[PDB]
Amino acid sequence: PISPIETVPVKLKPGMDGPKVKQWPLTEEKIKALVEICTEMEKEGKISKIGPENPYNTPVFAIKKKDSTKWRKLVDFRELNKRTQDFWEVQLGIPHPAGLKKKKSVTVLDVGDAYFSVPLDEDFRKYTAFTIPSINNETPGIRYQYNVLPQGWKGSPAIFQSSMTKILEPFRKQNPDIVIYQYMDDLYVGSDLEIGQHRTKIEELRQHLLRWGLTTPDKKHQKEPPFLWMGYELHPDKWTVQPIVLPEKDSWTVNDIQKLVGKLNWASQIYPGIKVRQLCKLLRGTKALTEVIPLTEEAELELAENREILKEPVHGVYYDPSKDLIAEIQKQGQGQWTYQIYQEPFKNLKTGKYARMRGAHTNDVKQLTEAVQKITTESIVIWGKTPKFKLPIQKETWETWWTEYWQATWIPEWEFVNTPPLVKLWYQLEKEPIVGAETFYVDGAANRETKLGKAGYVTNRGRQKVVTLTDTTNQKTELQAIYLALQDSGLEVNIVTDSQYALGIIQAQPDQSESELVNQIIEQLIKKEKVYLAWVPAHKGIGGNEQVDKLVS
Amino acid sequence: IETVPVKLKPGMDGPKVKQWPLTEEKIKALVEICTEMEKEGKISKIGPENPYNTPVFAIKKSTKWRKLVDFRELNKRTQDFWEVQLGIPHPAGLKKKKSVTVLDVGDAYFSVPLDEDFRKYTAFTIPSINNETPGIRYQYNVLPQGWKGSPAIFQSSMTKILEPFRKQNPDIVIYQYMDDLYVGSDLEIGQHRTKIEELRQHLLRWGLTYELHPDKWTVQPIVLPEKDSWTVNDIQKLVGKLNWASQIYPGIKVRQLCKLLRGTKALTEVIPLTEEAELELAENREILKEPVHGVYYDPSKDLIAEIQKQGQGQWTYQIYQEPFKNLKTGKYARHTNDVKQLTEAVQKITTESIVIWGKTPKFKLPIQKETWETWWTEYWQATWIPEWEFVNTPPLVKLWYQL
Ligand SMILES: CCCn1c(C(=O)c2cc(C)cc(C#N)c2)c(C(C)C)c(=O)[nH]c1=O
């Protein structure tokens, strides 16, 4: 049918007029095909013969489906698209399974000829005018316009979705104890009634759609669980991803490895502890898709763990609105984090995996704070509330970080759980100068053209030293001078610099870096006992600043 | 009543800002509220043919969920209108007044119809959890709170409404900024409060049902330590600080003090003071106390605000248009929630900013974008929303404004 529902007013973009593409002349079998379709369509009410005045045209085409002997009508709305208004998003975000409440009763309902069952803005049909050429293109062709929503037009998915929503509305108000999920042109219906009173309202629902143009599958034509969907496999009281098979190959091409990383990432939302770092290092470079990549030791070790975790099947449970959500996070490796959400231990609603790094230098406390946030937003999206957290970090560790760090920060309600590795601060810089500790005044520099570089220091006990660096930047040297002061000093040292740069880096208490130097500066800072870092203005003639400043050039 | 025709800025299109995820409690709240004002006909459901969108969410101002709309995008896309075509002039007298009370008059806009052909630009979406259903979409039919056009379009009515009260108290300053009325007088506080109540009654006959003290506003001057003993370390700090200050204040001198730091001394060593140095030190304090010479407000230019976390629930901030030309600086103090406090400071600073310049500043916030974006809505209880970007505080900036 063609639903009675009001139409949605459509416009074209404001400075624009509708399409006028020329019809490409079509062979004879294609002309015959299009006639056979379009007459059957105007019988159904879907289109209508017009006669020019109508100046508009979108080209037509017929294709063979595609070993069978059936044909199909393709329209190239390419241009009417371009000239049509933007619509609202048909749907932004799709439901995550782990967000679903368990249901007593489930039925899937499937709209038929959905787009063609919905009227097109009468004022707009004129722009849909298309034209079937005559044989060897000699006479005036047959010219139709759409009455319903054309397959492949810009406005159709939005307008259909909208129409299915106004039509479901009165029934939703009346049947609030029942959930309908609209995805594309399907419907999913669940309630906590018994199969009887369920199919009672199911039919009662179909007979509501039917008053409105919408024809559906009856009792005899409804699929049963699992309802594979969108990558998931959905059962009556639990869910999992669709079955994942890791290929078995001797050679791996870049394309074999990208597909694997994906299938793993997908598994990662219900299979705890999946890793992909070692496999991802592999993709770096400028290779083609056909290039075979020899797996590293650590990648194979890693494909191994993954190969095992996936061996036995795992499932996720459904959401019980009357319990708290509990999120558990573990440091799983070098900047890699894994988490689990559950309400009753340890039956997970879902699992997940955090791997980003923020900046060139972070420490675990920072990285852990970023995961909490990431996990928090996610929870808002899937369940509408934030979880109780359980983190591998003492309250005192966190409390010492928050307080002394300059950024504002905050995680919601959490608890320490002893799941090593624990996260700790790896060194504290002193808040005051050390006494009887050798004060190094360090400095570094570089010729912007030569790219030559000197880094050195002068101390108050008369020591000096200045090494040379080849092709280094004015700021690389400044870290070097500090690495320097740290190599050549005892377990306690004051260090003075003019680099706000170096300052900033070190005062952040990094514990990993995208820098070799900074990684070494770090391991030193670890080995020390007290270290006090201090900044001074360059070129003001301050302290021993001027001295070492001369040693370098 | 006849609707003022509203145009966007030339060429540019309306807001397409997507809706942030909301908590079930805020969603329910919004559903009620909106079901209500649709009955009353303030908003109507809209279809997919409206491409536009701006975020909404719920706050608590009192324990009655209010509905807030982020019209920042719309505001920028309309700002020929609320600035140059109409325009509510700022009184320089407001900051001078002994007491200023801020009144919410946004309920006033809900009476005036909105230009038919502008309404599509006010579309918002109440989202759904786990994307279970499509959001519920609405546009406005009346002037919306939060939009800079509503006070601009309602100016003629506000003047009429306020006209008698102004005539009867010609020495009282009343400013309108967005959803708020600002009322300043020099009266003793009881008389002042009494005068506000008279005002409410006038307001009350048209459907319009806290106290600043702007005088008590002064610089958070750059603070130079006074010390029993100075170590080299303490001198170097002192030089750093003055070396900063000299980019802002003219006259700043350092020389007599750097003299002290010749050679390579241990940091923890005590250097006694020069008669010159101590003379310098004082005249610097003279300068630091005073407002920057040569720094002036340019109404054609954006206000910027920067905030440093000082620890101990202390927060320093400066406002300026060209970096280091500070129009003013201050501190804000005293839950040990970092984000709660920051949110409070942003509102306070924005408030002062409106009173002095009729402008909100763009804020540079010392916090991870994502952290701030998750949480700020839990503590925001103001009716406008300023612009913000996110910034790592340079370790030196923070200390130079230390207290
Ligand atoms: C049957 C258990 C899953 N389930 C569903 C549901 O069946 C469903 C859900 C989604 C998002 C997609 C698909 C598909 N394909 C099916 C529902 C429906 C009625 C929303 C439910 O409420 N609870 C539930 O456990």
From Swiss-Prot, chain B:
Give, from the UniProt record, the effect of changing L212A: Complete loss of RT dimerization
What's the effect of swapping F71L? Confers multi-NRTI resistance
The listed outcome for I129T is: Confers resistance to delavirdine, efavirenz and nevirapine
Q: What is the effect of changing S62G?
A: Confers multi-NRTI resistance
Phenotype when changing M178V: Confers resistance to lamivudine
In the record, the effect of S62Y is given as: Confers multi-NRTI resistance
Name used for this protein in its record:
p51 RT
Naturally occurring in which organism (per UniProt)? Human immunodeficiency virus type 1 group M subtype B (isolate HXB2)
Gene that this polypeptide is encoded by: gag-pol
Which stretch of the intact protein is present?
592 to 1016 of 1435
